[PDB]
């Protein structure tokens, strides 16, 4: 629900470690 809605905002750090 509105939970995953938290990932987008985290998409920042994600871009950091994911593409680290």
Short mmCIF file of C-alpha atoms in Angstrom, two decimals:
data_model
loop_
_atom_site.label_atom_id
_atom_site.label_comp_id
_atom_site.label_asym_id
_atom_site.label_seq_id
_atom_site.Cartn_x
_atom_site.Cartn_y
_atom_site.Cartn_z
CA UNK A 1 0.00 0.00 0.00
CA UNK A 2 1.24 3.40 0.99
CA UNK A 3 4.20 1.45 2.41
CA UNK A 4 6.16 0.95 -0.78
CA UNK A 5 5.48 4.66 -1.21
CA UNK A 6 8.57 4.94 1.00
CA UNK A 7 10.91 3.34 -1.55
CA UNK A 8 10.69 6.23 -4.11
CA UNK A 9 11.89 8.69 -1.48
CA UNK A 10 14.67 6.22 -0.61
CA UNK A 11 15.45 5.91 -4.28
CA UNK A 12 18.26 8.30 -3.40
CA UNK A 13 20.31 6.05 -1.16
CA UNK A 14 19.30 3.17 -3.39
CA UNK A 15 21.03 4.89 -6.29
CA UNK A 16 23.97 5.12 -3.90
CA UNK A 17 24.53 1.51 -2.73
CA UNK A 18 22.59 -0.24 -5.49
CA UNK A 19 24.77 1.46 -8.10
CA UNK A 20 27.69 1.57 -5.68
#
